Ligand binder design. Structure first.
Ligand SMILES: [Zn+2]
Lengths: 1607, 56, 41, 40, 41
């Protein structure tokens, strides 16, 4: 039969007109029966809330205590299966308090009853249903009409109005569940009583629907006005005087104000919920008339619009010139003879920026920008996916509206809905081939005017919005939508990067950086951030001129009239309001204007249509407005509510600037055609909305009460059943967990909603078994379970993960905790036989086995849609692109993939992606999941999907009630599941699959306190020490710690990534050569972001990698995925915080699953047979290291970039004999001027820039350092202090001394020049395991332990006292203990001397601190601390277990106290600065005396050592420093001259022996001033003295001789 | 005769400078009638009809 | 005799002709812009 | 040097024809833009 | 070297310069007309 009532939830907006159309002069038979069923007294359809307050149910109608105990048990096992402990109690107590309160249980049982009524009537063959008693109220449904009756009184409504009321009760249930959970889990108390008061309040407001729904419209603006009033006392609120909320209902205003005094964040969260309050009618009387009146208003005269349009085209050309010269360093063309500035004609040739140029508008009228690129019509298919339906060609709008509504209002039948009138999806109509060719689709835009069939705009009222008049969101034809996609991509890829306003907004790193700058400035308040909200942003443009720049953008893309149709398109678009059951009149097959329901040919293009061109227009007039008043601008803007960062001007102080700037922007923007009122902008550091996310002072608000109460559209190409609702609930919990909502709140809400949906769809026989209901959740969607928030790690972790060990650990905890045996787990799971590998393998996936679970609905989406497009589309189009079927050739490819051993996932994925079969399969993969394709794919396959729903319901009823056991899983459960997961893959696939198995953090890592963690069992660990004790406040405020040719480039990345392994498999080369010929490329042989929610918490924690026994030192890196480990630690901390405990101690992750740590098998893949598609349509080290040097040089040049774009390991394996040479070559061959050099001199002596941080990251372990022939010359030559001072005196040295440069001037590579910058990083990542440098020499420092000759005995003569750093070496050699315990109160550089000593195994008292060992490893260069100090015992120690340095008080600890005076007649050391106390007793450690040693590199300081043959040249080097630094212009040389003075005083003790200036372009220095222009500014010295003095003066400059002589 | 080539080469240099002048005089005179093409499109029934297309 | 000195200005006179062709196309676009002005005002 | 000077003469000739055609276009466009005070 | 046509092509360059000057002249006149338009729309 015909399917009735096809929606389980409502997406359409509400209207009460069809109720009034049914009440008078009904014609359809079910309308007549609805009139018969209603009583004499009918309440209005807007007043339906007054009927729905009176609906009371008999309390405790559903016995759900088994659901309560089941939910407690499910929460207990998911808490214990994450191996966290304290979070059992608070979660189930919050669930119990949700299910125990009488009003919340009444609302929730109303939700269960509503869902049972819907599940009995949705997808039901019977048309009308009998009287169903919802509590006290009788509901009787006939066809589409719904009759609600409480005794005498009644309300008549639609089925969509019934879904609006049912979704109101549903979203109220979601809000109440999430509010009990959130009030139990967040810093503020119970939300619950506020919503309980507000429901009775909104049903107790004695107003008509227009007035209290106007209050509903102003819930968010008046709460925002109250927040702006209370938070800003200097600037008064502007929205507080326009609305009627304080006057119409004083108790409501009192409650909102009380919530404001408690917490304005609480007020914004409560005010931000949408549909827990009743659905408004979207203001048919007033609001649609007001919006369509504002869409066609003419507010300003065209003369000022004309002049101001030139005034803003000037600043558009200014911004595009600034971007193009900042990127490509070419000035766009300038005007010459009839009127221009001559300095700009000079500056075009010279290519120099003019700062006073941008303040002038009349000169950029003269300066016109040349074409720079061409328009590419074809876009990516990954941005045409969703978020907007289409009209086929001006025919869907007749189909949308009710024939009955138009029949009663206008007396004609509208000739009924004519047809389906094309697919509602943009994708389905695009791929069908009517509008397939995108240049042929956009050629009407190239002609200058659109076709008549495309110019339509049907305005959809946005449900789930506070504003009840709302933004009637636009919906155009396919041609206009493809125009929007291609033009937005053309701006975002090219033009928006060339515009400084939007180069921040489109680049994600630059968007984060702009958001960080805004969050600092709006909270400091010195230069605060304001917001120009534009209520009529879409309506305020004009069809004659939009204040446009499209005339210049048309020339820059070399297109003709393509954006000039954009300004004329507001004339073309016919506007229709898509309120459901609303008639606008049809005139001639086209609408006629009435001003309320329709408006033909308005002044605007559409609501939300063409957002980015309009964004440039609004931003251009605002920046020329702020440039006329000389205040520095930034803009965050993409659409409505455009936010402008204000800085401090040179004209007025920031308060006077602030008020003057608001008045000036009102005057100028009012002149621009957007009539800004006094309310729409505010001079306040309060609030802004960006990217459909609200921000209060830059902090994003918790959207838990809004997003979870927002019901999911769901049923995506699927029949409405259990599994689709569970998967959409899981994805909603994931989307909450990404958008600043705690995934434990999401998990508790998901468990509650899970068991509610089970109670809708299951009999009580399953329900009365508590242990079975506990069993049902924890299986997982891979091995035969339903999708839960519990069993999806993707909710918690990032996109790519392998959930199999987590599911099996869940099942282990299920067996061990509950009374459920292994046989009951077996009968629930039903693992089955699962033979053959024949179909497509699951790699970097959820990793389903060959068994497909019986609970997942087997919707095909590669047979039925393929047969539908084969039968329907007689035109081939997308068919004639794929000559043969996609999955057959891809499956033959997978059968050939079955032959190989290495089975690498990413390699196969990228090589598959080079083939066009992946392009077609990605189109079909886009057909599987979308929000637009569902609207056309649910309408097909009628009455079989309802039978699928009933059949799946009975199938899962039989499956969950099965007995004994289905298939055996008994050996796999106990112990670990390394061999068991490989056995499941080897059983389902018949062969061992490697590279797909990611050993999970649930097994391998047990979170612990260090007192709770064991050292000798749980070896490797990642510990996250906090800077502050976290609370629920700490998840809101940040801390100090920090966060297609592309396929061809990635294929070549894989190519020269295979050169790491030194395996020469010819089959690999032949298959990738065939795929390169498939590409058609010219050269055959071419030479901690985390999830985001816990990002704020991660700003208070640190991260490391401290796994040094058996997994880090190997050449083949073991399987640890670090970012998921970091995320797991952050979620454990978040759980401990939201329970009620505090993170006051560092927490580590404990090594339990010892077998799961697998070493990678470095083996190359072999394809046995040639692929049948074939397309349809010198050593690398020298060039890598030279290009690495010039990359460091250019990154340091552009700092005054982010150089962490590499694998960290491969540079440590790479030799750096060859890096340093062309690090110097670029800086000697650039030959910059003095003022440009000044910034590079200034920057490098401070620890600034990501380049310096990446250089300090790669200089922790360095066998590369000792091998470098400059470094074994320069380290004898200059004084090296730290890592930063050595590297800074290394890279800056080609500027300031050519003397060492001329020694190694005769070396360069000829193959260096024929290497592009897109190949160099590939050659850096090509020589990793070619040679790993496995020597890692311990450059042994002063070992003592005996009697021998004095070799110098130095340790840290530059930073600390040198006598303190020797006794750390000297204690442990007397103890003869390989173990030592170090606490982080010791300076990290001092401990480096202790860590140089070989044959130790140091187990520190870290408290588990990641940072202390990372510092004393980072100070190292030789690598004795990466090897001897073996960490996974040290990182799991909180206190004294062996001989301990570092705590001031401890049982048997070695403590260091500074001694101010001692004789200490000892040949090794001159004195004893720090006395050592062994086990808190002092022992004289002077018996230890030095020995002959090996080669040293650190902590012994070669230039102040015995060697002087490099120091004689170092004197010439420091005189080169001082002759170069005076010639450097625009620099205050205080610290660099101090470093020169350090080197000069060190040199002056050897020579036997202060005005700085230049006379006659030659630097002459003495202590006495030669002229008026001159500016006034240890025992190692004994060993640095040498015999036969006078040879230093041989080959010495005369200026150095004048420098050394005093006066 | 190198100088005979060089004098007319300087003449072509002057001609190129005047050509860069012409390329911008025309682009000034786009703007004032381009905003007039904009400024009167009030939109009673949108009677626009562009005639000559453009090459890509 | 200098063939390369002839050839450089031979390429220059052609790119000058290309500039003239682009100006002709842009000015006919200006003509089609001012064609709709007379029925508008 | 016969071919180079010959094709140079052809290029200068077609440049001359192109500039006279654009001069005719300028003459037409002046007559088009002198109607703008007849309209406004 | 063929220096006889060098003078002829230089004179033709001079004719091209004359055409450039008269095109800039008529551009100046219609620039004046379009600029005096813009005050009264
Ligand atoms: Zn395991």
């Amino acid at each position: 039969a015909g399917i009735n009532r096809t929606d389980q939830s409502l997406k359409n907006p509400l209207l009460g007109t069809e109720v009034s159309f049914c009440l008078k002069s009904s014609s359809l038979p079910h309308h007549v029966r609805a009139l018969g069923q209603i009583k004499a007294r009918n309440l209005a359809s807007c007043d339906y809330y007054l009927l729905f307050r009176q609906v009371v149910l008999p309390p405790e109608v559903y016995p759900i205590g088994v659901l309560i105990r089941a939910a407690e048990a499910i929460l207990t096992v998911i808490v214990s299966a994450w191996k966290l402990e304290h979070m059992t109690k608070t979660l189930y107590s919050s669930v119990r308090y949700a299910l125990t309160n009488p009003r919340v249980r009444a609302q929730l049982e109303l939700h269960i009853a509503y869902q049972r009524i819907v599940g009995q009537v949705s997808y039901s063959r019977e048309a009308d249903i009998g009287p169903k008693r919802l509590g006290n109220m009788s509901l009787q449904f006939v066809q589409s009409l719904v009759i609600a009756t409480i005794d005498t009184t009644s309300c008549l409504m639609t089925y969509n109005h019934f879904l609006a009321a049912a979704d109101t009760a549903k979203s109220r249930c979601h809000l109440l569940i999430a509010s009990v959970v959130q009030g139990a889990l967040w810093e503020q108390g119970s939300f619950l009583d506020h919503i309980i008061n507000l429901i009775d309040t909104i049903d107790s407001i004695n107003l008509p629907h227009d007035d209290y729904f106007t209050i509903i419209k102003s819930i968010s603006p008046y709460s925002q006005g109250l927040v702006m009033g209370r938070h800003n006392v200097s600037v008064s609120s502007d929205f507080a005087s326009v609305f009627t909320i304080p006057e119409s209902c004083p108790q409501l205003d009192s409650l909102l104000k009380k919530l404001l005094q408690l917490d304005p964040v609480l007020l914004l969260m409560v005010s931000s919920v949408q549909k827990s309050w009743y659905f408004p009618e979207i203001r048919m009387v007033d609001g649609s008339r007001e919006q369509l009146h504002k869409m066609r208003v003419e507010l300003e005269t065209p003369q000022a619009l004309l002049s101001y349009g030139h005034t803003l085209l000037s600043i558009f050309r200014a911004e595009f010139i600034k971007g193009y010269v900042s990127k490509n360093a070419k000035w766009p063309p300038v005007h010459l003879l009839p009127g221009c500035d001559k300095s700009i004609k000079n500056a075009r040739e010279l290519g120099r920026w003019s700062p006073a140029f941008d303040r002038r508008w009349q000169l950029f009228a003269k300066v016109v920008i040349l074409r720079i690129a061409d328009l590419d019509m074809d876009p990516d298919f990954n941005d045409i996916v969703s978020d907007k339906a289409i009209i086929s060609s001006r025919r869907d709008w007749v189909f949308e509206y009710n024939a009955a509504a138009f029949w009663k209002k206008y007396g004609e039948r509208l000739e009924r809905p004519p047809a389906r009138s094309g697919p509602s999806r943009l994708v389905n109509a695009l791929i069908d081939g009517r509008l397939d060719n995108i240049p042929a689709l956009l050629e009407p835009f190239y002609r200058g005017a659109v076709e008549f069939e495309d110019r339509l705009t049907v305005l959809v009222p946005k449900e789930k919005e506070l504003k009840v008049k709302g933004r009637f969101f636009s919906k155009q034809t396919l041609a206009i939508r493809i125009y929007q996609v291609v033009a937005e991509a053309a701006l975002k890829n090219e033009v928006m990067p060339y515009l400084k306003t939007h180069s921040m907004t489109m680049s994600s790193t630059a968007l984060t950086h702009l958001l960080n700058r805004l969050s600092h400035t709006i909270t400091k308040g010195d230069s605060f951030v304001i917001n120009l909200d534009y209520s009529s942003w879409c309506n305020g443009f004009r069809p004659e001129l939009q204040a446009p720049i499209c005339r210049q953008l048309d020339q820059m893309f070399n297109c003709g009239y393509f954006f000039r149709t954009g300004c004329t398109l507001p004339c073309f678009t016919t506007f229709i309001i898509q309120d459901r059951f609303n008639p606008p009149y049809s005139f001639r097959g086209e609408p006629v204007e009435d001003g309320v329901t329709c408006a033909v040919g308005t002044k605007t293009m559409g609501e939300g249509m063409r957002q980015k061109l309009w964004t440039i227009l609004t931003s251009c007039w605002e920046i020329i407005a702020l440039r006329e008043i000389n205040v520095t601008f930034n803009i965050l803007g993409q659409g409505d509510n455009q936010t402008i960062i204000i800085h401090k001007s040179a004209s007025q102080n920031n308060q006077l600037l602030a008020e003057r700037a608001l008045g000036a922007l009102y005057k100028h923007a009012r002149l621009a055609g957007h009539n800004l009122k006094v309310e729409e902008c505010w001079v306040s550091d309060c609030l802004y909305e960006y990217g459909k996310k609200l921000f209060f002072r830059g902090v994003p608000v918790p959207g838990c009460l809004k997003q979870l109460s927002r019901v999911t559209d769901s049923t995506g190409e699927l029949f409405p059943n259990l599994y689709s609702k569970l998967a959409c609930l899981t994805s909603s919990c994931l989307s909450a967990a990404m958008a600043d909502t705690s995934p434990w709140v999401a998990l508790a809400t998901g468990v509650c909603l899970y068991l509610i949906e089970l109670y809708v769809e299951l009999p009580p026989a399953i329900m009365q078994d508590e242990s079975l209901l506990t069993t049902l959740c924890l299986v997982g969607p891979s091995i035969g379970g339903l999708p839960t928030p519990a069993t999806l790690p993707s909710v918690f972790f990032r996109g790519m993960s392998d959930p199999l060990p987590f599911q099996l650990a869940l099942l282990q905890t299920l067996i061990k905790t509950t009374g459920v045996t292994c046989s009951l787990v077996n009968r629930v799971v039903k693992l089955r036989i699962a033979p053959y590998p024949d179909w497509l393998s699951l790699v970097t996936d959820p990793t389903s086995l060959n068994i497909a679970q019986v609970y997942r609905p087997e919707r095909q989406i590669r047979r039925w849609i393929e047969e539908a497009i084969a039968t329907s589309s007689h035109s081939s189009r997308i068919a004639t692109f794929f000559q043969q079927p996609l999955t057959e050739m891809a499956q033959l490819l997978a059968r050939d993939l079955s032959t190989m051993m290495p089975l690498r996932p990413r390699d196969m994925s990228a090589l598959f992606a080079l083939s066009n079969v992946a392009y077609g399969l990605s189109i079909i993969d886009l057909f599987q999941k979308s929000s637009t394709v569902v609207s056309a794919s649910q309408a097909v396959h009628i009455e079989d999907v309802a039978l699928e729903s009933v059949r799946y319901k009975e199938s899962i009823i039989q499956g969950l009630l099965d007995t004994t056991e289905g298939y055996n899983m008994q050996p796999y459960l106990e112990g670990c599941t390394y061999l068991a997961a490989k056995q499941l893959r080897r059983l389902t696939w018949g062969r061992d699959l490697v590279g797909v198995t990611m050993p999970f953090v649930a097994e391998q890592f047990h979170p612990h306190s260090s007192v709770g963690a064991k050292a000798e069992l749980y070896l490797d660990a990642i510990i996250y020490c906090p800077q502050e004790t976290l609370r629920s406040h700490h998840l809101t405020t940040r801390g100090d710690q920090p966060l297609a040719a592309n396929l061809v480039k990635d294929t070549l990345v894989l190519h020269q990534w295979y050169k790491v392994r030194k395996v020469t498999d010819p089959h690999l080369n032949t298959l990738m050569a065939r795929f390169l010929l498939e590409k058609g490329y010219t050269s055959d042989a071419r030479p901690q972001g985390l999830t985001g929610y816990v990002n704020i918490l991660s700003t208070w924690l640190r991260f490391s990698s401290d796994y040094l026994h058996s997994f880090s030192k190997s050449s083949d890196d073991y399987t640890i995925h670090f970012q998921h480990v970091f995320t797991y630690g952050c979620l454990y901390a978040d759980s401990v915080i939201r329970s009620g405990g505090v993170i006051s101690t560092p927490y580590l992750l404990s090594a339990s699953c010892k077998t799961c740590f697998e070493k990678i098998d470095s083996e190359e893949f072999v394809l046995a047979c040639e692929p049948q598609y074939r397309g349809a349509e010198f050593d690398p080290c020298v060039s890598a290291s030279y290009c690495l040097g010039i990359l460091i040089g250019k990154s340091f040049l552009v700092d005054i970039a982010n150089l962490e774009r590499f694998s960290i390991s491969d540079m440590q394996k790479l030799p750096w004999s060859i890096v340093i040479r062309s690090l110097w070559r670029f800086l000697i061959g650039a030959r910059l001027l003095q003022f440009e050099k000044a910034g590079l001199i200034r920057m490098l002596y401070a620890a600034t820039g990501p380049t310096f941080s990446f250089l300090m990251k790669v200089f922790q372990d360095s066998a590369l350092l000792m091998d470098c022939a400059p470094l074994d010359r320069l380290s004898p030559r200059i004084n090296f202090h730290s890592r930063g001072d050595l590297v800074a005196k290394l890279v800056l040295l080609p500027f300031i001394n050519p003397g060492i440069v001329e020694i190694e001037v005769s070396g360069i590579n000829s193959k260096y020049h024929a290497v592009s910058e897109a190949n160099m990083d590939l050659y850096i990542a090509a020589a990793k395991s070619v040679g790993v440098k496995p020597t890692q020499f311990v450059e042994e420092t002063n070992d003592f332990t005996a009697r021998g000759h004095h070799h110098g005995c130095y340790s840290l003569s530059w930073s600390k006292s040198r006598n303190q750093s020797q006794v750390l070496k000297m204690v442990v050699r007397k103890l003869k203990l390989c173990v030592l315990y170090i606490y982080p109160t010791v300076d990290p550089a001092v401990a480096l001397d202790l860590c140089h000593l070989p044959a130790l195994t140091i187990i520190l008292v870290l408290g588990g601190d990641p940072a202390y060992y990372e510092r004393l490893l980072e100070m190292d260069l030789c690598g004795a601390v990466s090897s001897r100090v073996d960490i996974p015992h040290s990182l799991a120690a909180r206190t004294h277990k062996g001989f301990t340095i570092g705590p001031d008080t401890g049982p048997g600890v070695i403590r260091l106290d500074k001694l101010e005076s001692v004789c200490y007649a000892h040949p090794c050391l001159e004195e004893l600065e720090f006395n050592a106390y062994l086990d808190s007793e002092l022992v004289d450690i002077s018996d230890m005396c030095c020995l002959p040693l090996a080669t040293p590199c650190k902590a012994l300081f070669r230039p102040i050592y015995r060697s002087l043959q490099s120091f004689r040249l170092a004197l010439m080097d420091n005189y080169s420093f001082v002759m170069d630094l005076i010639l450097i212009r625009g620099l205050d040389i205080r610290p660099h001259l101090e470093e020169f003075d350090e080197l000069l005083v060190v040199g002056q003790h050897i020579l036997g022996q202060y005005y700085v200036g230049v006379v006659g372009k030659r630097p002459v220095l003495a202590r006495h001033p030669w002229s008026a222009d001159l500016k006034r500014i240890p025992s190692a010295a004994r060993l640095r003295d040498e015999d036969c003095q006078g040879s230093l003066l041989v080959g010495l400059p005369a200026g150095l001789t004048q420098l050394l002589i005093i006066d | 005769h190198s100088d005979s080539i060089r004098i007319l080469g300087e003449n072509i240099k002057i001609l190129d400078r005047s050509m860069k002048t012409m390329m911008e005089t025309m682009k000034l005179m786009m703007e004032k009638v381009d905003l007039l093409y904009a400024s009167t499109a009030v939109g009673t029934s949108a009677p626009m009809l562009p005639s000559h297309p453009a090459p890509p």
